[PDB]
Amino acid sequence: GSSGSSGWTCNKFRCGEKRLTRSLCACSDDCKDQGDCCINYSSVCQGEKSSGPSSG
C-alpha cells in the first residue's frame, strides 16, 4: 500500500526505538545527540512517568 502521510509526531512506544525507514522525524535516543527529535518528542517521550499507574 501507500507509504503514508506526514507524521511529524512520535508515540510513547516509538520512544527508544532502533528501526526507522519511512518517518520524517526520529523517535530514538540518537535523535537527541544528532538533532532529529520529533517536535513533540519530549512531550511524548519526556512525559510524566514515575511511580504512577497511568500518565493520563
Key attributes of the depicted protein:
56 residues; mainly alpha; Factor Xa Inhibitor; 2 helices; 0% strand
Total number of domains: 1
- Portion of residues in beta strands equals under 5%
What is the element string, with H for helices and E for strands?
HH
Number of helices: 2
Radius of gyration: 12 Å
CATH topology name, in short, is: Factor Xa Inhibitor
Tell me roughly what share of residues is in helical segments. Answer: 10-25%
Characterize the biggest β-sheet: none
Disulfide bonds: 10-27, 15-45, 25-38, 31-37
Glycosylation sites: 40
Organism: Homo sapiens
Family: Belongs to the nucleotide pyrophosphatase/phosphodiesterase family.
What does this protein structure show overall?
This protein has one domain (1-56): Factor Xa Inhibitor. 18% of the residues lie in helices and 0% in strands. It has helices at residues 29-34, 41-44. The longest helix is centred in the middle third of the chain and has 6 residues, at 29-34. The protein is globular, with a radius of gyration of 12 Å. Residues 8-50 form the SMB domain.
